[PDB]
Structure 1
Amino acid sequence: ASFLSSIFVPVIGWVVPIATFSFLFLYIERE
């Protein structure tokens, strides 16, 4: 099942930092 690399690596490469940075930027800039 070597096709899981095609679906975990782009999520951790792209989706994981986009979801993390967009959470943290809205959390540090929160009155």
Structure 2
Amino acid sequence: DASFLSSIFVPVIGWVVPIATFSFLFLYIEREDV
């Protein structure tokens, strides 16, 4: 009955992890601090 975990993890791994990862890395590679 733990098959509901896929409807959380696959949209997380497909949208939330890419958006957060790319947003951090975009702001990081364009920053002039570090």
Identify the TM-score tier after normalising by the shorter chain. over 0.9
**Structure 1: 5+ residue stretches without partners:** none
Note the aligned Cα RMSD (angstroms): 0.3
- Higher RCO structure, 1 or 2 (CA under 8 Å, sep 6+): 2
Which runs of 4 or more aligned residues in structure 1 lie more than 2 Å from their structure 2 counterparts after TM superposition? none
**Structure 2: 5+ residue stretches without partners:** none
Q: TM-score, normalised by structure 1?
A: 0.95
Cα distance in 1 for residues equivalent to 2:27 and 2:3? 36
Cα distance in 2 for residues equivalent to 1:27 and 1:8? 26
The structure carrying a bigger helix percent of its residues is 1
1:25 shift after superposition: 0.3
Structure 1 vs Structure 2: percent identity of aligned residues?
A: 100
